[PDB]
Amino acid sequence: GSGLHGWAFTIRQFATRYAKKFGVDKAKMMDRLWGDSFFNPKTKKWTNKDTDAEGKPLERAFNMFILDPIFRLFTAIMNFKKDEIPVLLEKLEIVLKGDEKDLEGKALLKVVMRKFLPAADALLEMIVLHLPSPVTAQAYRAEQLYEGPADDANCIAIKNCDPKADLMLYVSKMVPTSDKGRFYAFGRVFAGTVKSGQKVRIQGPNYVPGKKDDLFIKAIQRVVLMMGRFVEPIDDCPAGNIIGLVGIDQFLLKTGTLTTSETAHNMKVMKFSVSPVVQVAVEVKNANDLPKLVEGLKRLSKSDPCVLTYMSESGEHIVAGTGELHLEICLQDLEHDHAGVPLKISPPVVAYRETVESESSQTALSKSPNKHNRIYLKAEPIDEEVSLAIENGIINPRDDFKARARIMADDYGWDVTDARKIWCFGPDGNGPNLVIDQTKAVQYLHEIKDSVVAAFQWATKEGPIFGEEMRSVRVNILDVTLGGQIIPTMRRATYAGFLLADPKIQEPVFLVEIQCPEQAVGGIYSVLNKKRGQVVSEEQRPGTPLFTVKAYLPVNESFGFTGELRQATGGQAFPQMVFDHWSTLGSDPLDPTSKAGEIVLAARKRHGMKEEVPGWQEYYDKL
Amino acid sequence: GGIREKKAEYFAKLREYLEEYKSLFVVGVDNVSSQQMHEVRKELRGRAVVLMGKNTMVRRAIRGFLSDLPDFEKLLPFVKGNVGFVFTNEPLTEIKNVIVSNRVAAPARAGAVAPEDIWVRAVNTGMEPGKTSFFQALGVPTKIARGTIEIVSDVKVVDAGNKVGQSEASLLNLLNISPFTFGLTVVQVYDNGQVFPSSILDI
Amino acid sequence: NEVKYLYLRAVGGEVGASAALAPKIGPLGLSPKKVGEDIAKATKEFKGIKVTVQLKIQNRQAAASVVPSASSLVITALKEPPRDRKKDKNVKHSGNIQLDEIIEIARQMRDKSFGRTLASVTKEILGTAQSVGCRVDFKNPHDIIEGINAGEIEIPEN
RNA sequence: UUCAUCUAGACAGCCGGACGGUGGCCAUGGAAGUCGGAAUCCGCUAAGGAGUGUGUAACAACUCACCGGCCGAAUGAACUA
């Protein structure tokens, strides 16, 4: 059929009319209609052969009893055969009336065949004949509509579809209306009866029945009916039906389970396999009107089930969506409805991480401005795995130095006297850069340590290349010759140690899981070969040609990876971007031709600092 | 001069084979593969020796050898087409039996004259049901059972002597059915100054 | 009761990767684990070598039968230490194999090779051992091939 | 001009073989003749290069060098002015 001309048909109804004129029932009619179906009009004999004993081809039954009426009515009323309109009408038992007699052409087709085959009888009859009712549907669908112990009483209630069982709902989306922000909770009542003023437990996705996280035992203000665009309050709603309700809005975020029993767990909080991948930096054009942006971001996160608003490491408001279509529609809604403020859109400026890979060539010396105390140190790279352990919390800055040193030395292979003599970690009191003491002849190793930790915190929150954080730097303090005097010394000393330890930059690296067909793997491999994609590996399940690629991808090309990949491969591919880890780069920041030099110079022109990359010459104190 | 040397050694090999071996088989090698030739020689290892070359050097050697051996003048009007020879001294019946026994089937090609009747049996194809349109276009009754295509009956596709066309050849390629057989075909037999065909051998 | 033969190449001496074993075995419904340890048990002494294994699949069981290849038999003539794929990159197989061993692997390969004589089949094996890089009795496989071609090295035909 | 192929039949054309160790040594996220470096080996004939290109995620597949059937007098390459 077609909705533009408003019609639909099935061979089931054609059987309903063909049964009386042929004497054979519905199912056998349509069996001699689909497949190898042929009928012989010279002997009135249905056969499974396109030809006969004489051998001229016959035509199919689907073409002689159905498509032949459709074809001849098209030919007659498109080529203006008024000698053929009424006879075909009375043959096909159509009746016309008034103006509908008087119509001609495309609108004649519209009316006479809306009278022949309405869309209602067909589309309605399939959706009630074969499409499932909630009792059977939940009776085989109970174990994914609930993530947990499948033998629970609420689950057997779902499997039995009891209208008066324990009430559970699932607010699936936070549907928008013209209430100037306040939405409605569009959700399905799988079990129970929702009432206006019933005490219901709001369960978040992070909730487990043995805890209290995101759980609100609250009452419902009103329950409303949904018919697409209008609003209409209803008193109660039973199991197996989808209803709207208001009052959950100020307590529930986006999606949520709505139970009445504490034994019942949560359910499957979606699966997507789409994910918010494309990310944009949002800020304001008016710092005074920034509160409307923050409220609008919160409201947009409530509105769209797959939008994600979060803060970056560099401070901008990262909005993450699925594609360029979805971002542009979320942004137009945010700028005109959610916030009402003109915004600015930008690429998601990335936080980079300065890191040396060498031991310092010559001893790192710095001196006090009053010239009384001197500091000698070295800077050396730390292993990737052991820095990951520090950032994962195996190596927690609050334990006893002894047992830490035991784990550091026996598992990770360090000098254990140092590992007991560990001083500090940076940044933020938990970072992977650590300061180690080697000094043995210094008498007062107590009046310097707090200043040491403080301005190491300052250096590691602002390194020397372009004023950004550090990673995997171990600082060997070799000698000190003895906060107003010590802090600049170690600032300059860490600076000289870094620049003499030959720095580079770590760029962030995503792990992306692309679901793709085996006939579009070529396009995806072409895209990753455009942009430096080191695919970790290659998995799939055998029953389907769907095929997942797990891959490492950098961010400066991930800006636009999504559009380029989908343009090259069609919509066949689906990415799953999650952040993996930090990988090293192979270019020098001091050389502006290379990638590291270009990115640091772009950062300096962005932040309005000095143009050159400062070094151990002017960060050294000579006689 | 290397080409002159290899054809001189070819003439010498033909001389010694003609003198050593009493009986000859002139065999067509039309559409026969190099690997199949290797297993033909494997089956004739130490049994009978297979020599072939360009028929022009064969004819030149024969009419240079007509001075002492004039029965290869009777062998002359038969070196036409893709022709090899096998030299032998043991009986011609099982020489022919081994030669016609070594056969390898080949896939059908479009527009090609079918040597035998081509039948597609009621065998489970193992293919996804998207090719049922092709099966219905070629008239083979197929049913989608257990999620795969089942051929219902045994259907003749191409008659013997008729041209296999593109759709039938593509169906045979998809079903991995190779009705076309290719092998060495004994066309003439020489023995004791006389020439007589494989029909007289089959007598 | 349809005996199907599936040719798969897995790393010998190790359990094969389930992702690699999945596409050819999963539609046939066998357990990728169980065909993995079956191939490993068949290829214990082929450690570190990509070795062709024919799976005889019949009635929901797969019998892993090793199809012996020239390179695999030449490495299991060398008896070199098992290959560590991660550390060293350009292992030149510099071990020494002897003529009685190349005769015995020719005798093992007699059922599949198309050479007329044991001399020709050992010449093929010497060519494969040259492709690997092996030295045969401290002499080049090339030079040994022309030695047998001239007939200085008589090979017993038994 | 120099060199090479040629009635023991070339050049072109039409038809079809264009195999095996081999997914060669590695490299593999993945490379089977065709992303990359080094080896450029003979078993057998008519011949097949660890492969001349197209193509594939790699395969598959197509097509060449080489070779055979028809064929009946010259042409193939690189230069020179």
Swiss-Prot record, chain A:
Outcome of mutating residue 279 to E: Reduces sensitivity to sordarin
Modification N6,N6,N6-trimethyllysine, positions: 298
Top-level enzyme category: hydrolase
N6-methyllysine modification, residue list: 298, 402
Major subcellular location class: cytoplasm
Mutation effect (residue 348 to L/R): Causes resistance to fusidic acid and sordarin
EC number(s) recorded for this UniProt protein: 3.6.5.-
Ways its activity is controlled: Inhibited by fusidic acid and sordarin, which prevent the release of eEF2 from the ribosome after the translocation step. While fusidic acid acts on all eukaryotic eEF2, sordarin specifically binds and inhibits only selected fungal eEF2.
Consequence the record notes for mutating residue 312 to F/P: Causes resistance to fusidic acid and sordarin
Positions bearing Phosphoserine: 368
Molecular function in Gene Ontology: GTP binding; GTPase activity; identical protein binding; protein-folding chaperone binding; ribosome binding; rRNA binding; translation elongation factor activity
This protein's pathway: Protein biosynthesis; polypeptide chain elongation
GO cellular component: cytosol; ribonucleoprotein complex
Binding-site list for GTP: 2-4
Transmembrane segments: none
Biological process, per Gene Ontology: maintenance of translational fidelity; positive regulation of translational elongation; translational elongation
Modified residues (Phosphothreonine): 494, 544
Crosslinked residue numbers (Glycyl lysine isopeptide (Lys-Gly) (interchain with G-Cter in ubiquitin)): 622
N6,N6-dimethyllysine modified-residue sites: 298, 402
Maturation and modification: (Microbial infection) Diphthamide can be ADP-ribosylated by diphtheria toxin and by Pseudomonas exotoxin A, thus abolishing its function.
Subunit structure: Binds to 80S ribosomes. Actively translating ribosomes show mutually exclusive binding of eIF5a (HYP2 or ANB1) and EFT1/eEF2. Interacts with the 40S ribosomal subunit protein RPL9A; the interaction is direct. Interacts with the 60S ribosomal subunit proteins RPL12A; the interaction is direct. Interacts with RPS23A; the interaction is direct. Interacts with 18S rRNA; the interaction is direct. Interacts with 25S rRNA; the interaction is direct. Interacts with RPL0. Interacts with STM1; promoting ribosome inactivation.
Note: Present with 160782 molecules/cell in log phase SD medium. There are 2 genes for eEF2 in yeast.
Similarity field: Belongs to the TRAFAC class translation factor GTPase superfamily. Classic translation factor GTPase family. EF-G/EF-2 subfamily.
Swiss-Prot record, chain B:
Cellular component GO terms held in the UniProt record: 90S preribosome; cytoplasm; cytosolic large ribosomal subunit
Similarity comment: family membership: Belongs to the universal ribosomal protein uL10 family.
Subcellular location per the Swiss-Prot or TrEMBL entry: Cytoplasm
Residue numbers bearing the Phosphoserine modification: 67
Main location: cytoplasm
UniProt function note: Component of the ribosome, a large ribonucleoprotein complex responsible for the synthesis of proteins in the cell. The small ribosomal subunit (SSU) binds messenger RNAs (mRNAs) and translates the encoded message by selecting cognate aminoacyl-transfer RNA (tRNA) molecules. The large subunit (LSU) contains the ribosomal catalytic site termed the peptidyl transferase center (PTC), which catalyzes the formation of peptide bonds, thereby polymerizing the amino acids delivered by tRNAs into a polypeptide chain.
Species of the source: Saccharomyces cerevisiae (strain ATCC 204508 / S288c)
Disulfide-bonded cysteines: none
Lineage, highest ranks first: Eukaryota, Fungi, Dikarya, Ascomycota, Saccharomycotina
Protein name in the entry: Large ribosomal subunit protein uL10
Record's keyword terms, sorted: Cytoplasm, Isopeptide bond, Phosphoprotein, Ribonucleoprotein, Ribosomal protein, Ubl conjugation
Quaternary state and interactors: Component of the large ribosomal subunit (LSU). Mature yeast ribosomes consist of a small (40S) and a large (60S) subunit. The 40S small subunit contains 1 molecule of ribosomal RNA (18S rRNA) and 33 different proteins (encoded by 57 genes). The large 60S subunit contains 3 rRNA molecules (25S, 5.8S and 5S rRNA) and 46 different proteins (encoded by 81 genes). The 5 acidic ribosomal P-proteins form the stalk structure of the 60S subunit. They are organized as a pentameric complex in which uL10/P0 interacts with 2 heterodimers, P1A-P2B and P1B-P2A. uL10 directly interacts with 28S rRNA.
Annotated GO MF terms: large ribosomal subunit rRNA binding; structural constituent of ribosome
GO biological process, one term: cytoplasmic translation
Glycyl lysine isopeptide (Lys-Gly) (interchain with G-Cter in ubiquitin) crosslink, residue number(s): 13, 96, 143
Residues of the full protein shown: 2 to 204 of 312
Lineage: superkingdom: Eukaryota
Keyword Phosphoprotein: yes
Swiss-Prot record, chain C:
Subcellular location as annotated: Cytoplasm
Main location: cytoplasm
Post-translational modification: Although not reproduced with a second method, methylation at Lys-4 cannot be ruled out.
One example of a Gene Ontology biological process annotation: translation
Keyword line: Cytoplasm, Isopeptide bond, Methylation, Phosphoprotein, Ribonucleoprotein, Ribosomal protein, RNA-binding, Ubl conjugation
One Gene Ontology cellular component: cytosol
InterPro entries named in the record: Ribosomal_uL11, Ribosomal_uL11_C, Ribosomal_uL11_C_sf, Ribosomal_uL11_CS, Ribosomal_uL11_N, Ribosomal_uL11_N_sf
Residues where N6,N6,N6-trimethyllysine is found: 4
Superkingdom, natural source: Eukaryota
Modified residues (N5-methylarginine): 60
GO molecular function, one term: structural constituent of ribosome
CDD domains from the UniProt entry: Ribosomal_L11
Cross-link (Glycyl lysine isopeptide (Lys-Gly) (interchain with G-Cter in ubiquitin)): 123, 139
Stretches assigned to coiled coil: none
Record-listed Phosphoserine modification sites: 18, 31
Quaternary context: Component of the large ribosomal subunit (LSU). Mature yeast ribosomes consist of a small (40S) and a large (60S) subunit. The 40S small subunit contains 1 molecule of ribosomal RNA (18S rRNA) and 33 different proteins (encoded by 57 genes). The large 60S subunit contains 3 rRNA molecules (25S, 5.8S and 5S rRNA) and 46 different proteins (encoded by 81 genes).
Additional remarks: Present with 68500 molecules/cell in log phase SD medium.
General function of this protein: Component of the ribosome, a large ribonucleoprotein complex responsible for the synthesis of proteins in the cell. The small ribosomal subunit (SSU) binds messenger RNAs (mRNAs) and translates the encoded message by selecting cognate aminoacyl-transfer RNA (tRNA) molecules. The large subunit (LSU) contains the ribosomal catalytic site termed the peptidyl transferase center (PTC), which catalyzes the formation of peptide bonds, thereby polymerizing the amino acids delivered by tRNAs into a polypeptide chain.
Family: Belongs to the universal ribosomal protein uL11 family.
Protein name: Large ribosomal subunit protein uL11A
Organism per entry: Saccharomyces cerevisiae (strain ATCC 204508 / S288c)
